[PDB]
Amino acid sequence: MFTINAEVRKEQGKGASRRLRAANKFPAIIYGGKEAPLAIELDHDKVMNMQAKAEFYSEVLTIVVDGKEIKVKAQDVQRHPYKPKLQHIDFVRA
């Protein structure tokens, strides 16, 4: 029942990730199985309120990108060192 709307990244790197971080957003990626890893671009303000629940890190997520629906889980998350915000989340496509 966890639905996160996302988009597809068009630029990637360090300078592309810090422009995207100053606009209340952060990049992610969906990988796993045998398909190509899809670069995931989503908003920070929604997902920061989603990870307060304990079921965000255990249940199956539903990330909606390009009109499709991909069932994923949470594998690895990078906290900011001194601010309550995120940088990157690894999603296992499962």
Partner: peptide, 9 residues
């Protein structure tokens, strides 16, 4: 300093 809490994973 600040106040932090143990988060899952």
């Amino acid at each position: 300093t600040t106040f932090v809490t143990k988060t899952v994973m």
